[PDB]
Amino acid sequence: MQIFVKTLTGKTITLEVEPSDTIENVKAKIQDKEGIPPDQNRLIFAGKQLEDGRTLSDYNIQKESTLHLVLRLRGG
Numbered sequence: 001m002q003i004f005v006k007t008l009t010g011k012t013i014t015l016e017v018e019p020s021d022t023i024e025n026v027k028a029k030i031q032d033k034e035g036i037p038p039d040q041n042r043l044i045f046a047g048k049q050l051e052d053g054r055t056l057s058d059y060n061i062q063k064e065s066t067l068h069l070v071l072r073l074r075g076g
């Protein structure tokens with residue numbers, strides 16, 4: 001079970017996860033392959049905003065899925 005994630009730089013990531021992997025783990029894995037702190041970053045899938053406490057199956061995320069990474073800023 002691997003997934004893909006599109007960063008705000010336009011890069012594509014590839015990671016090994018499981019149907020019972022929490023968003024907290026999946027969001028840590030992305031920091032290992034790209035330099036992104038847990039600031040100005042939030043994981044999204046098909047527009048469904050994701051956060052910690054839940055797992056891939058709760059959010060109904062299947063294998064070889066492509067997720068998005070987004071932020072919010074008022075100083076620009």
